[PDB]
Amino acid sequence: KNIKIMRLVTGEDIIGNISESQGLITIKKAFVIIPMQLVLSPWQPYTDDKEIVIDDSEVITITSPKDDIIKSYESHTRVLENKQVEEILRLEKEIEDLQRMKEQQELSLTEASLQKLQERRDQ
Amino acid sequence: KNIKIMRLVTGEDIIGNISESQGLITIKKAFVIIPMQLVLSPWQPYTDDKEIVIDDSEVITITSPKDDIIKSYESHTRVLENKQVEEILRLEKEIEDLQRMKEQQELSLTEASLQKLQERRDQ
Amino acid sequence: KNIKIMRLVTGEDIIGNISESQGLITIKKAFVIIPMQLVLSPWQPYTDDKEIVIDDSEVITITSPKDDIIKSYESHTRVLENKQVEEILRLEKEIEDLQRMKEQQELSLTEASLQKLQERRDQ
Amino acid sequence: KNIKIMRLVTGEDIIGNISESQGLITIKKAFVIIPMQLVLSPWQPYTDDKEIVIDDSEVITITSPKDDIIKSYESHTRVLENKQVEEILRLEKEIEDLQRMKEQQELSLTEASLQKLQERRDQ
Numbered sequence: 099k100n101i102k103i104m105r106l107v108t109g110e111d112i113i114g115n116i117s118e119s120q121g122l123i124t125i126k127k128a129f130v131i132i133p134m135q136l137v138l139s140p141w142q143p144y145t146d147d148k149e150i151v152i153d154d155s156e157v158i159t160i161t162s163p164k165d166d167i168i169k170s171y172e173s174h175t176r177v178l179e180n181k182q183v184e185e186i187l188r189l190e191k192e193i194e195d196l197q198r199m200k201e202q203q204e205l206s207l208t209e210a211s212l213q214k215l216q217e218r219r220d221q
Numbered sequence: 222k223n224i225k226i227m228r229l230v231t232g233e234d235i236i237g238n239i240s241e242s243q244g245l246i247t248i249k250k251a252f253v254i255i256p257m258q259l260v261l262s263p264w265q266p267y268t269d270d271k272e273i274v275i276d277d278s279e280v281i282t283i284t285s286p287k288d289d290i291i292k293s294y295e296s297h298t299r300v301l302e303n304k305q306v307e308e309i310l311r312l313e314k315e316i317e318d319l320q321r322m323k324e325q326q327e328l329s330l331t332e333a334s335l336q337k338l339q340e341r342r343d344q
Numbered sequence: 345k346n347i348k349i350m351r352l353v354t355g356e357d358i359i360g361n362i363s364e365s366q367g368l369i370t371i372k373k374a375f376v377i378i379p380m381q382l383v384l385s386p387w388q389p390y391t392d393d394k395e396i397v398i399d400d401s402e403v404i405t406i407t408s409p410k411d412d413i414i415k416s417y418e419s420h421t422r423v424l425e426n427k428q429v430e431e432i433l434r435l436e437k438e439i440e441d442l443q444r445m446k447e448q449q450e451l452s453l454t455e456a457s458l459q460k461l462q463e464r465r466d467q
Numbered sequence: 468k469n470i471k472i473m474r475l476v477t478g479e480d481i482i483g484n485i486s487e488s489q490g491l492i493t494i495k496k497a498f499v500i501i502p503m504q505l506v507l508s509p510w511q512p513y514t515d516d517k518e519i520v521i522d523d524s525e526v527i528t529i530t531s532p533k534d535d536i537i538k539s540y541e542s543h544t545r546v547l548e549n550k551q552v553e554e555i556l557r558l559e560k561e562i563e564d565l566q567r568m569k570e571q572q573e574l575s576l577t578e579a580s581l582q583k584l585q586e587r588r589d590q
């Protein structure tokens with residue numbers, strides 16, 4: 099584990115897990131720090147990739163942060179995971195309930211209705 | 222097929238498929254006729270059984286109806302089946318969409334998060 | 345266990361545990377279903393008998409219900425038992441407290457007062 | 468086919484078909500993603516070239532996107548083509564109608580008028 103803040107050539111502050119292998123660096127769980135206490139936002143809200151590879155030629159400064167920001171970052175990154183798991187449980191329960199109710203509703207049906215059901219499902 | 226209206230000892234009018242075997246009669250797709258044009262309602266809205274067996278000692282009159290009521294009954298009994306099939310398709314599509322979205326959401330997860338997911342699902 | 349709804353000659357819907365032995369049937373934990381969701385009420389609120397015996401000649405239809413009503417009936421029949429037990433605990437605690445307080449109050453008394461107490465209790 | 472979102476040094480998000488051959492990359496059907504649901508806009512609205520060649524030294528991150536954005540991008544890129552074809556049909560029909568009407572109008576003319584027509588067309 100290695101948490102190091104950095105400043106991008108664009109002019110923004112990125113905090114996350116860093117790995118510097120061969121110049122090009124790998125970033126995990128990156129967060130944009132908005133100056134405003136502190137506010138953190140997702141860096142790449144359009145991708146699900148765990149790691150993002152960038153080039154060291156496009157980063158200005160890489161430095162270790164103070165402990166308060168470390169605590170805030172850890173708290174935020176565990177709250178997000180907890181909420182994600184809670185939503186997964188909610189979705190699974192709703193899916194199970196809907197499937198059971200649909201099964202019971204479909205159970206009471208006639209033969210011709212079942213044939214029409216199959217035909218329209220095929221269509 | 223045999224459609225015969227009847228009047229119950231309670232004082233209500235039941236229309237549906239009738240079968241008189243050994244005194245006790247079997248009724249399918251029974252409908253209560255409300256005097257008000259004509260209005261039909263389900264007879265036993267708390268059961269999913271296709272056939273209901275009653276005793277001939279508890280029915281006053283059993284007579285064949287006119288053609289207009291036959292047409293209305295057939296129209297209503299096909300509209301109900303059509304709506305039932307449409308709702309079955311709606312439910313199946315919603316279930317499939319929800320399952321797919323939950324699968325994609327669960328795909329992006331970490332190992333420790335997956336372990337916590339499994340533990341809480343077991344609980 | 346056997347839950348079957350039935351319709352009485354009076355024109356009401358009874359749900360509960362049923363046992364058909366020799367024509368005459370035994371009913372346990374009967375509930376009147378009021379058409380209004382669903383609302384259930386006690387059938388015989390003036391008796392404490394667990395089982396009630398009626399005659400099959402006085403019942404119109406006996407049919408198995410759908411699963412939603414089964415779930416509602418089970419929930420209601422466990423909530424009633426839970427509330428009954430809670431009230432039993434409340435009454436026992438109140439009785440114990442009152443008895444203890446009366447005992448301490450009676451402890452501080454004189455001999456002539458005790459004799460008058462005994463005489464008036466005898467009266 | 469290969470759809471990968473990327474972030475430019477300018478600070479914008481480009482989604483489209485990507486091909487990385489020799490460092491310099493080729494982009495087809497590029498779209499600017501405006502953060503606002505999602506909104507997509509054309510990247511180069513002043514050129515008709517199918518492919519645009521850029522340099523990898525001018526791109527920060529290249530990552531695969533999630534499925535929702537893929538679906539939205541495919542829907543938008545088929546709607547645009549459908550509308551383009553519809554407009555082509557509209558224009559062709561209008562041109563044919565105008566040409567036919569002009570032909571019929573020109574048919575009814577005199578010899579001297581035809582000579583003046585030819586002279587002024589030559590001018």
Ligand SMILES: [Ba+2]
Pocket residue numbers: 154155157158159
């Ligand atoms: Ba540097």
Ligand SMILES: [Ba+2]
Pocket residue numbers: 277278280281282
């Ligand atoms: Ba009779």
Ligand SMILES: [Ba+2]
Pocket residue numbers: 275276400401403404405
């Ligand atoms: Ba009977």
Ligand SMILES: [Ba+2]
Pocket residue numbers: 152153523524526527528
């Ligand atoms: Ba690069």
